[PDB]
Structure formats: C-alpha cells, structure tokens
C-alpha cells in the first residue's frame, strides 16, 4: 500500500496558532492531520473544521475518539456532517478511552476494561448500521479491540508504546493476530502506527546505546527495531520505514507534533 503520512497535532485552548500549525503540516508534505479526544484539548470535530478551512489536500482524522464520550447516534450525525461539509476529507479513528480522571470529570463510569471495549464495539456496530460515510479507524492492541478492527475498520492502528515500548517481535505477533481475525478482509484494511520519537543522528548505534537508560529491559539492537522509534539520518529512516512496511504492513505512519519538522525530510524521500 502506498505510504500516507500523518502528524498528531494538539489544538490547545488559549493558544492562537492552530490555523498556522495546520498550514505548516500541509506545507511540509503531510497527508493527514490527526487530532486527539481529551478534556482540556479543543473539541476534535470543531478543530478539524477549522483545519479544513485553511488546508486543501490533507485528510483530517480523529486519533482516536474516546468511545465513552460519544453517543453513537449523535456521533453518526457529527460524522455525516463533517463528511458532507468538508467534501469528504474526514476520517474517524475510535478507541476505548484510557484516562480515568477524564471519565470521572465528565461524570462517566470507568467500569472495567470489558465494559470500555464493549462500548467501542456497540458504537462501531451502530456507525456501520447507520452507513456513515467517513472511513473508520480502530486503534488499540488488545485482543478484543483488534478483533473489532478486523470486523469493522477501514484502518487498524497498532500501538507501539503502552510509556513501555513494545518490541518488534511483540508487534509481529499483534499484526499476525489482527491478520488472522481479519481473514478475507485483511487485504482491505490499511495498517497504521504512531511513531513516538523521531531522533535525527549521524550515529544511530551510539544513540540506541544511550537510550537503554530510559528502556532498561531492552538491548540496543531491540531499540533500533522498535516500531515506535525512528533513529538515524533521513535516508536511514526512509529505509527503515520501507523495511517496516514489508515486515508489518505499516503504510500509514503518524508522528507527534514535536517531530513535525524532524520527520518532514523523510516524506521528501518517500
């Protein structure tokens, strides 16, 4: 699958730079602007409309919605509106939610991991029944969540950092698990992951050795294979992404806002 690159931007209350930041993302060659779903962050679909008004080619995605925050019928209303009024530029990533304090602040039941995944399941089923036109992404590494992505999603997002970094070998197993559940639909589902850190260096080997301090359970060799880290020159990072597309199927790669400019040269090469 051809590469698509995203940057996860945080639209921040009290800061006046949103439209400028979105323009910088598009001008730097990103294909997707991704926004999160948190209390204390701007509301995601409203922020995405503001981004759409100042950009022309990028897709806009949630990354990912906290399913506890959304009534499925009203979310379907939001998605149809975002789709029609942007001319088809909106995608919806969904997940279970994970910050308990936000559940408590909003007056919502934290429940159990099982009830939070069931809410995601119920919402995905309802959105598909309502035939929402926005492509749907499902994120998260749990068995049930990957099973729901296999059933319902256009894009599956694998998490590489739980932060505890997951090894390439554990990611091999998660991708294979997803593929087995997807069965005949596997070829129809785009695979995404978020790179947490983009570390520009002329000595990737010395860099990985120093990073063992923050990841003691890993060898330097494992660190250089972590899907959530990109280390080296732009050319080395492009080669790494080519290898990881072959290994994991990852063609939709997102980075964090702080690394927007660091990663842009890799887009130039790929």
Residue numbers in the entry: 25 to 186, 196 to 303
Sentences from the paper on this structure:
Central to this pathway is PepI, an F420H2-dependent oxidoreductase. PepI first catalyzes the formation of the central statine, then produces the C-terminal statine moiety. Among these, the homolog kvPepI from Kitasatospora viridis DSM44826, with 53.3% sequence identity to PepI, was more amenable to study. Through comprehensive structural and biochemical characterization of PepI/kvPepI, we confirmed that PepI/kvPepI sequentially reduces the middle β-ketone followed by the C-terminal β-ketone or methyl ketone.
Upon F420 binding, the kvPepI structure remains virtually unchanged, except for the stabilization of the residues 187–190 that are part of a larger flexible loop (residues 181–201). The crystal structures of PepI and PepI in complex with the cofactor F420 allowed us to identify key residues His62, Tyr122, and Gln229.
